[PDB]
Amino acid sequence: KKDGYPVEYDNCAYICWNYDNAYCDKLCKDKKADSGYCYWVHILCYCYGLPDSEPTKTNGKCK
């Protein structure tokens, strides 16, 4: 398991709906994580307990 910002190709994270924590929680759980929230500093969804196989953000900008 891992915690992090889930991404789509390539290295592009999921922006929150507004600043909605519930949105990110649902998104994260649909990706099989334990939970998630909207990190307001970046306005991105952050997940707790993603599967090891789910891609997460690394050092790098969105393609």
Side-chain angles (χ1 to χ4, degrees), residues 1-8 11-62:
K1 292 170 78 179
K2 56 176 180 174
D3 309 330
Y5 307 90
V7 294
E8 32 179 12
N11 211 31
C12 313
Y14 291 83
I15 59 169
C16 311
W17 178 257
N18 301 319
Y19 287 102
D20 207 313
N21 285 327
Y23 168 76
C24 292
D25 188 55
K26 186 182 194 337
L27 173 71
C28 291
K29 285 178 181 180
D30 283 348
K31 291 180 184 294
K32 308 297 179 281
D34 301 328
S35 65
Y37 75 106
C38 180
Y39 190 21
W40 95 91
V41 172
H42 305 126
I43 318 192
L44 298 175
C45 291
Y46 187 94
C47 303
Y48 294 96
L50 287 157
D52 285 352
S53 57
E54 271 299 327
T56 46
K57 193 169 192 49
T58 64
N59 264 332
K61 295 286 164 35
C62 183

